[PDB]
Design an enzyme around this catalytic site. Structure first.
Site, PDB file in Angstrom:
ATOM      1  N   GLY A 157      34.713  38.188  50.960  1.00 12.40           N
ATOM      2  CA  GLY A 157      35.404  37.674  49.792  1.00 12.40           C
ATOM      3  C   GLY A 157      35.548  38.675  48.671  1.00 12.40           C
ATOM      4  N   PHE A 213      36.652  39.387  39.711  1.00 13.11           N
ATOM      5  CA  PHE A 213      35.196  39.525  39.521  1.00 13.11           C
ATOM      6  C   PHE A 213      34.410  40.625  40.282  1.00 13.11           C
ATOM      7  CE2 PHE A 213      35.752  36.304  42.848  1.00 13.11           C
ATOM      8  CZ  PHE A 213      34.824  36.746  43.803  1.00 13.11           C
ATOM      9  N   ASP A 261      39.533  24.616  38.494  1.00 13.80           N
ATOM     10  CA  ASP A 261      40.074  25.232  39.672  1.00 13.80           C
ATOM     11  C   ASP A 261      39.838  24.435  40.962  1.00 13.80           C
ATOM     12  OD1 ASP A 261      41.701  27.098  40.904  1.00 13.80           O
ATOM     13  OD2 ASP A 261      39.923  28.382  41.350  1.00 13.80           O
TER      14      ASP A 261
END
Ligand SMILES: CC(C)(C)Cc1[nH]nc2c1[C@](C)(c1ccccc1)C1=C(CC(C)(C)CC1=O)N2
EC number: 2.7.11.26
Length: 345
Positions: free
Chosen positions: A28, A32, A143
């Site tokens: 992933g 960030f 989200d």
């Protein structure tokens, strides 16, 4: 090859301990930083480590939020800990779950099929549970999408994940409009509202519900502004009073007038009528008109889940559905009469 770190537990006294793990691989990615998988040597258990560049100036919003949360339907922060690459990173040790609602919904619709409605009840009930809990702390996820619903396919346990956009909203303090993923983005927000509530998460939740009954997204917008148009095709042009209730910052959309395409005709014939009733009370223009997550758990579409004999399609029991806390019931405690049935004391 074994890595040992000094990690503070997330739901624990502020007390660092040695933690060791192995089998590191990338899984992933985002503005960030990066997300890894690892295997804890202690339990042999699999976990995700979300690695985030962290300016020592600031606190990490996500971390503050994750240290408060403790819920069966929320991804749990096992540990967090710092590392290097001046470069200082926060690492968050979080649950690893092998599937998502996105992927499962996708398997069904690549095959033109409908996801069985029992699963729709199971998954949605748990999502509304997770939102009841965080909304009780005044925290908006901002989200909600099927991709951020983790899913153990064998237990049917759904866990709300990814709190990178999450925030504590306080009346008065304004907030960003261009937030949430487009397809799941509440209309207040597309009108530029900065004074919104946590009812944006509920709009998104009804978008997930709709998608699970239709097999594709209900509002697939070309842009943050075509998103309004897509919505308007279904709900029709919002009235002057609805537009006012969204407390907008700009209404100069010069949108054509479209009539409301009634709810029952949006979904495939013989969609259960309770799914549509629920769906229409989530996807409302007026944010104050939408059900609270907790009323949504109390809705009659989920009654099958409260049946004493209910079981999963794979034969097993349902997960814990009735073990509400006082924190979790705060917004409307009487609902417990409906929520927690006779046969679970
Ligand atoms: C807890 C995290 C930070 C959200 C990581 C996590 N824990 N469990 C997961 C993830 C991942 C890495 C994730 C990342 C972002 C949003 C949701 C999910 C993840 C899965 C399933 C798949 C199939 C491997 C796809 C995938 O991306 N499962």
């Amino acid at each position: 090859k074994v890595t040992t770190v000094v990690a503070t537990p997330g739901q624990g006294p502020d007390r660092p301990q040695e933690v060791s793990y192995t089998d590191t691989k990338v899984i992933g990615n985002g503005s960030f930083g990066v997300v890894y998988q690892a295997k804890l040597c202690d339990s042999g258990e699999l976990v995700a480590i979300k690695k985030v560049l962290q300016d020592k100036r600031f606190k990490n919003r996500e971390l503050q939020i994750m240290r408060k949360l403790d819920h069966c339907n929320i991804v749990r922060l096992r540990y967090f800990f710092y590392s290097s690459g001046d470069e200082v990173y926060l690492n968050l040790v979080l649950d690893y779950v092998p599937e998502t609602v996105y992927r499962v919904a996708r398997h069904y619709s690549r095959a033109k099929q409908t996801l069985p409605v029992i699963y729709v009840k199971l998954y949605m009930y748990q999502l509304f549970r997770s939102l009841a809990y965080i909304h009780s702390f005044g925290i908006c996820h901002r989200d909600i999408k099927p991709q951020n619903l983790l899913l153990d396919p064998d237990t049917a346990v759904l866990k709300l994940c990814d709190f990178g956009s999450a925030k504590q909203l306080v009346r008065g303090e304004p907030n960003v409009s261009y937030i949430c993923s487009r397809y799941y983005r509440a209309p207040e927000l597309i009108f530029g509202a900065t004074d919104y509530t946590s009812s944006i998460d509920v709009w998104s939740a009804g978008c997930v519900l709709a998608e699970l009954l239709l097999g594709q997204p209900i509002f697939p917008g070309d842009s943050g502004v075509d998103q309004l148009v897509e919505i308007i095709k279904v709900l029709g042009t919002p009235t002057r009073e609805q537009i006012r209730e969204m407390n907008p910052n700009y209404t100069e959309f010069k949108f054509p007038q479209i009539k409301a395409h009634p709810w029952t005709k949006v979904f495939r014939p013989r969609t259960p009528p309770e799914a549509i009733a629920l769906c229409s009370r989530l996807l409302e223009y007026t944010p104050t008109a939408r059900l609270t997550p907790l009323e949504a758990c109390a809705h009659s579409f989920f009654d099958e889940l409260r049946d004493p004999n209910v079981k999963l399609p794979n034969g097993r029991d349902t997960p814990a559905l009735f073990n509400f806390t006082t924190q979790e019931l705060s917004s409307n405690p009487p609902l417990a009469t409906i929520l927690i049935p006779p046969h679970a004391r």
